[PDB]
Amino acid sequence: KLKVAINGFGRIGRNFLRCWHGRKDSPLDVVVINDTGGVKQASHLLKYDSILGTFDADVKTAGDSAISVDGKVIKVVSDRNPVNLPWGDMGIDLVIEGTGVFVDRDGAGKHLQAGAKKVLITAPGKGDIPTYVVGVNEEGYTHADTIISNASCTTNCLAPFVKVLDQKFGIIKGTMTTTHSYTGDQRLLDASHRDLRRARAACLNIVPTSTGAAKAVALVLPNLKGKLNGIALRVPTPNVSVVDLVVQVSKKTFAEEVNAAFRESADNELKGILSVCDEPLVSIDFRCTDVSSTIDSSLTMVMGDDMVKVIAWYDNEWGYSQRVVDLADIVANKWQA
Amino acid sequence: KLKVAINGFGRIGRNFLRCWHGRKDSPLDVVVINDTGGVKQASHLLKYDSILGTFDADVKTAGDSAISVDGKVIKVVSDRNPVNLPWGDMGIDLVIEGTGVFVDRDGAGKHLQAGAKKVLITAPGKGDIPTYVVGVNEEGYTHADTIISNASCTTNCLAPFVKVLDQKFGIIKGTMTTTHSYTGDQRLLDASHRDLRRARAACLNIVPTSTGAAKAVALVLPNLKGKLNGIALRVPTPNVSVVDLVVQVSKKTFAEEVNAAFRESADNELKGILSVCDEPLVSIDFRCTDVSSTIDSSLTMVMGDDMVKVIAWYDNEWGYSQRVVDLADIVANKWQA
Amino acid sequence: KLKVAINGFGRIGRNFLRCWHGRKDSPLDVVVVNDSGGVKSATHLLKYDSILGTFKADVKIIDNETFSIDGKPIKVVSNRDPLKLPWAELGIDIVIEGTGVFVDGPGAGKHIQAGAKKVIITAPAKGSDIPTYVVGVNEKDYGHDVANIISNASCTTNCLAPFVKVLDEELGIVKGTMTTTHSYTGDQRLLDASHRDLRRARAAALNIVPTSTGAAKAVSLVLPQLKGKLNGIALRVPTPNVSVVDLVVNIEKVGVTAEDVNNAFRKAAAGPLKGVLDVCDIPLVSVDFRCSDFSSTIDSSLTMVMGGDMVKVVAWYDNEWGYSQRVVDLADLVANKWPGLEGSVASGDPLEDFCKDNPADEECKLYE
Amino acid sequence: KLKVAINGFGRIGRNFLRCWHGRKDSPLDVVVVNDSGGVKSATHLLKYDSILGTFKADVKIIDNETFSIDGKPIKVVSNRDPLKLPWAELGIDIVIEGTGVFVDGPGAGKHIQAGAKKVIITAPAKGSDIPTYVVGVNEKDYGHDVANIISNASCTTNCLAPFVKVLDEELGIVKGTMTTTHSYTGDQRLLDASHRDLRRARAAALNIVPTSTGAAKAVSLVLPQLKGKLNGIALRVPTPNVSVVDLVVNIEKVGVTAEDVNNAFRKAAAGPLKGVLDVCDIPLVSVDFRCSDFSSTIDSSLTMVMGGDMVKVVAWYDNEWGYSQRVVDLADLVANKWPGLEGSVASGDPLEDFCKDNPADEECKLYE
Ligand SMILES: NC(=O)c1ccc[n+]([C@@H]2O[C@H](COP(=O)([O-])OP(=O)(O)OC[C@H]3O[C@@H](n4cnc5c(N)ncnc54)[C@H](O)[C@@H]3O)[C@@H](O)[C@H]2O)c1
Ligand SMILES: NC(=O)c1ccc[n+]([C@@H]2O[C@H](COP(=O)([O-])OP(=O)(O)OC[C@H]3O[C@@H](n4cnc5c(N)ncnc54)[C@H](O)[C@@H]3O)[C@@H](O)[C@H]2O)c1
Ligand SMILES: NC(=O)c1ccc[n+]([C@@H]2O[C@H](COP(=O)([O-])OP(=O)(O)OC[C@H]3O[C@@H](n4cnc5c(N)ncnc54)[C@H](O)[C@@H]3O)[C@@H](O)[C@H]2O)c1
Ligand SMILES: NC(=O)c1ccc[n+]([C@@H]2O[C@H](COP(=O)([O-])OP(=O)(O)OC[C@H]3O[C@@H](n4cnc5c(N)ncnc54)[C@H](O)[C@@H]3O)[C@@H](O)[C@H]2O)c1
Helix, strand or coil: CCCCEEECCCCCHHHHHHHHHCCCCCCCCCCCCCCCCCCHHHHHHHHHCCCCCCCCCCCCCCCCCCCCCCCCEEEECCCCCCCCCCCCCCEEEEEECCCCCCCHHHHHHHHHCCCEEEECCCCCCCCCCCCCCCCCCCCCHHHHHHCCCCHHHHHHEEEEEHHHHHHCCEEEEEEEECCCCCCCCCCCCCCCCCCCEEEEEECCEEEEEECHHHHHHHHCCCCCCCCCCCCEEEEECCCCEEEEEEECCCCCCCCHHHHHHHHHHHHHCHHHCEEECCCCCCHHHHCCCCEECCCCCCCCECCCCCEEEEEEEEECCCCCCCCHHHHHHHHHHCCCC | CCCEEEEEHHHHHHHHHHHHHHHCCCCCCCCEECCCCCCCHHHHHHHHCCCCCCCCCCEECCCCCCCCCCCCEEEEECCCCCCCCCCCCCCCCCECHHHHHHHHHHHHHHHHHHCCECCCCCCCCCCCCHHHHHHCCCCCCCCCCCEEEEEEHHHHHHHHHHHHHHHCCCEEEEECEECCCCCCCCCCCCCCCCCCCCCCCCCCCCECCHHHHHHHHHHCCCCCCCCCCCCCEEEECCEEECCCEEEEEECCCCCHHHHHHHHHHHHHHHHCEEEEEEECCCCCCCCCCCCCCCCCCCCCCCCCCEEEECEEECCCCCHHHHHHHEEEHHHHCCCCC | CCEEECCCCCCCCHHHHHHHHHCCCCCCCCEEEEEECCHHHHHHHHEEEECCEEECCCCCCCCCCEECCEEEEEEEEEECHHHCCCCCCCCCCCCECCCCCCCCCHHHHHHHHHCCCEEEEECCCCCCCCCCCCCCCCCCCCCCCCCCCCCCCHHHHHHHHHHHHHHHCCCCCCCCEEEEECCCCCCCCCCCCCCCHHHHHHCCCCCCCCECCCHHHHHHHHHHHHCCCCEEEEEECCCCCCEEEEEEEECCCCCCCCHHHHHHHHCCCCCCCCCCEEEEECCCCHHHCCCCCCEEECCCCCCCEECCEEEEEECCCCCCHHHHHHHHHHHHHHHHHCCCCCCCCCCCCCCCHHHHCCCCCHHHCCCC | CCCEEEEECCHHHHHHHHHHHHCCCCCCCEEECCCCCCCHHHHHHHHHHCCCCCCHHHHHCCCCCCEEEECEEEEEEECCCCCCCCCCCCCCCEEECCCCCCHHHHHHHHCCCCCCEEHHHHHHHCCCCEEEECCCCCCCCCCCCCCCCECCCCHHHHHHHHHHHHHHHHEEEEEEEEEEECCCCCCCCCCCCCCCCCCCCCCCCCCCCCCCHHHHHHHHHHHHHHHEEEEEEECCCCEEEEECEEEEEEEEEECCCCHHHHHHHHHHCCCCCCCCCCCEEEEEEHHHHHCCCEEEEEECCCCCCCCEEEEECCCCEEHHHHHHHHHHHHHHHHHHHCCCCCCCCCCCCCCCCCCCCCCCCCCCCCCC
């Protein structure tokens, strides 16, 4: 029912698109979407994915203007300016900006300008957005935020458990790192990009970096700041990535102590959100997997009952979208506007 | 000058050989090899390398019985018996068993037991071998020590400065990890590997594991145990790995202060051994370079002035050889046993 | 129905239950495999593939050598020698060669007498003797219970062949040569590891090795009427699993366009060459066929002709998945091919019947 | 040196012993026959050849279980079922398939299960599983672990093979076909007696039979280079034991004189074919090579040519006698390949045999 169009029909565009098909009970009437890229491409792009494979969802469309897929015919155009991107022609309900290039509220404003009602950004918006993230900023979340954001998958995934750890054991200091994959955020080749590292090709090289995680943690976790700071490690992989953090937790504990604690959480709430296990499973074992990350039980060592390594294969793309999808439909509900 | 043979001779040995040549005035006259592989292959094994490209040195074999490299005749025995390999026709001084399968002193002794006299292994010598690594234990090594080994590249690489780590500030706790490359020891394609992780194909998946770095840490430095202990991560890369360690140091500090405290390290001890900088470089920008790593002084961030990040693209392969080739020279030096 | 098992455990040993359990028509059933690595592995192995994804199946760990498959159990062997493997006790009508070392039915025979009624050869066995078994071509033309060790040529050709078959079949072709994209695998080591061959020695997934393809000959082996007209090189390339050749072919016929032949594809693919031969139209890549069992993926558009007659003929394909479907191919075939009923000889006239018992009959000492 | 056993004495095996007795440094030794014929008879039958004269060596006919011969006390069984007959207590590494009856590969299992480790299959390639291995021809293709059940293909083939390589190898054929002058034997009914065969059923000693023989096939078996390329029926002619080949072949070569080819033969004879390929020059007949063991028998002249490409290839040879002294060499081959002996030459170059055991070595998995 939510007449929605997302900006930047990236993988996550397809993801949520697939999630639209994947997730059941989708009031997300996303009958339009934006990406300045070629739409029939995007169609085939939507049609054909690498990781989760081609979206076998056959779509029959008559004319460039109207496109229909799985009954839910869905428009899409290609343009840069959200004002040049008419939204009132549908009176758009929600937008998410997969481009990333609109990393400030103005574009959303500009999206709100052309006739959008609500906005969130999977990416941490530069500056003028208090982000919303499940587990962290979905509780005090208000549907009445016509413009909000998510953070990078990293934060979008690394959040809850350690907060609950912070809830159940506290953390003196946290040193978070990820196996952050590669994306358009980095240059395939050593193409000219602001971050020299993201500029490089690095087909097999990692990027020592720091995503908004150790920053968005501030918003999403009003407590865990500075003390609980690590960086990002943007790796030469395209796919589901892994958390790599060692904490100096506050309360004395040991490995399993958090595990069942981490278990029970997913056993009730991080259900769908996150997971935990110790069966050795590698990336391929996490295709289109939604429980953002199962945490290792063995290698999650604990030293002095505070120094605690943490590790979990996480879906930087689909589970991210999952999480992105999560509150997305939630704001569709409590549909104040 | 020191007659040497290499069992299980491999890349790192080939590296050591490309080292050996690059080691102008290599006091190891390594006129012998053990390698069950074919000679021209063994040539190409050294001759044609992937990472450092082919050996920039032409290889000539007369005709198949012996191969001469850089104007020096070389031999390569091939028999799975840890003794039958004729190390006595020369009465070998140093043996390097690549296979690592003799984590017990025995096989190495079995190598010595027909002419060989000294040993170092890529495998961490479990127990009945001096925990001997350059920067840390090559000195306390008295040349009477004959059969020693090197632990993990990681162990090997971290050793010197991580010793210097607790030097300059002391370390409350330490949990290290590597961006360890992919090799054939982990199943490059899915095969019967004990580690279910290392068992798959996983050309793009990581392997949670641990290392002698987590273990010899005590063996190389006593206090450095448990609290000073981490894990290993064999990652989808072929090349120079990075240390994923955050040291909970004792003395409060800020990042560069310790890097200042580690400028000197390169300036005095890590010279040749290790390096450090903050210009963003990637594994290829660490290729064939003997300073075992450069530390991301910048992103080796301080957090709470005790739990301090440590990050350094470390030469898991070439320096690893080099360090061993260094250690080899060390044992080429002080030659009594 | 037919008692099945696997010699050893491979990625193809990992390949088929994905099909088989996922299958709906498989009469036979495996009951045991030689995982010399433990069910825990084998499960983790089989439950979780590297490419086709985790097995969408409750293949579960019942007893360490007798696990579950969504309720169906299967035993496990753990060994590297036929002779101990009690295919007799296992009653296995059909076992799949998983050592490779059996480039010879003889070694496979070391299971035949061991209670293998028939032996599923999987790869191009250097033992020529076995009739070259390939679907769409000679699959039926195989003789049941005649030398029950049953060949299976290289997926590359084994997939190429029915296509390669249909072309001359559609055209008549002077001869042919090609080059597939042999995906990176284990046989070529991720490392520059000591190898009986210079090529697969090298660090695998970076270098790209052209190499030998008896599979090219295997065409003649399966297309004898096309003997000699075949060539090509085995380009080992760095992919997980898809190979694809373009086949240079001087077509004996006129030299009309390919689309016609592709219409003939569109005819014959849709004809008997369903299951194997796809001519998709959207120009698509490796991913676009993963987990897809259409055991050949031709691109009409991308395929071209040179002189109208020298046709540049391509086809995407996986290297084991489709191959794993070749398993079922004879499997259900050889199943119905299995007699089940009895014979109608005359142990007086066909006293060989009586001699089948009375083999020590001077009445029977033929050729011997 | 190796304990050997007979499941009833092979007509050839009988002399083969005396041959083996005529052998001196034999790494093998028979210890028992499954005499379902009475010792003294078998003894006489052994001590007395019916063709090349009785043994010129003592035979001590000791008790019904074990006579001796020149101090060789050899035991006696009497049974068609092996298992019971314990070649294991008899430590018989490899048992003479003294029946033929177990023409089926799986027949020999009972004999492995009767105390064999390997199996001297006396039978030509009735089954398909086991390949025979042939001196000068395909013997060396054997390593150990390769088919402990090992065929004794037809002398026809077995004498066909040796020279038949030269052509395809020294000079190159297109294809061709042959026909033995098969001496009379017992496996054709002396009179018209009830026998499942058409012809051999008829009265034997007087006539000749155009007769089915896949020796040409069995050659192509061990000569995949000739797989599905050659032909030939047999001719059971009335002689005790000798035969010559028909053989016509469209040689690929220009059509040089045979003499050179025969010199090349004689060269190749001088090569790997000592005792194997005789190319003599005296025009001689059946008698003139009886009890002569040189496996081939050609007055180099005799084999000749029509127009060069078509080659009138013909050569006398033995059907049992020489045939026997072919069995030992291969029977020796296993003992020559027997474990316990030091067999390390070079892996630093030729580790092919080294990792021939394990293809998952540093890198050994050729052909994936
Ligand atoms: N976890 C994170 O770090 C994170 C979070 C949010 C967004 N992102 C970035 O956004 C993308 C998220 O993953 P993805 O699967 O969607 O990959 P993606 O790169 O395909 O998604 C971005 C899409 O926006 C399009 N784009 C660029 N400029 C545009 C513009 N003016 N208007 C409309 N579209 C525009 C791109 O073509 C692309 O299709 C990635 O590019 C990623 O770099 C990353
Ligand atoms: N480079 C590192 O950082 C590191 C660290 C720890 C262990 N290792 C081990 O060391 C090897 C990498 O070193 P490398 O580049 O010198 O190549 P390498 O792989 O050839 O060295 C060791 C190899 O010797 C082989 N082997 C067993 N028996 C042998 C025999 N008779 N003759 C010859 N080889 C035999 C083993 O397969 C083993 O992989 C890898 O096997 C790896 O597992 C490497
Ligand atoms: N897929 C093709 O088209 C093709 C063609 C020719 C050859 N091959 C080779 O034949 C095999 C078939 O593919 P796959 O899916 O099985 O991958 P695979 O490589 O895992 O299959 C063979 C593997 O099984 C194991 N093996 C061998 N003998 C064993 C035994 N007695 N017991 C337990 N394990 C044993 C080994 O790991 C061996 O590498 C592969 O080795 C493949 O490389 C494949
Ligand atoms: N002599 C040869 O060169 C040769 C070789 C192969 C086959 N053949 C033909 O096939 C038969 C075998 O010939 P051969 O050379 O082995 O001499 P053979 O005929 O004497 O061999 C069989 C002998 O073993 C016994 N026998 C037969 N079947 C048996 C069985 N199931 N179990 C135990 N003993 C059995 C008999 O005593 C018989 O004499 C003969 O009928 C012959 O015509 C001959």
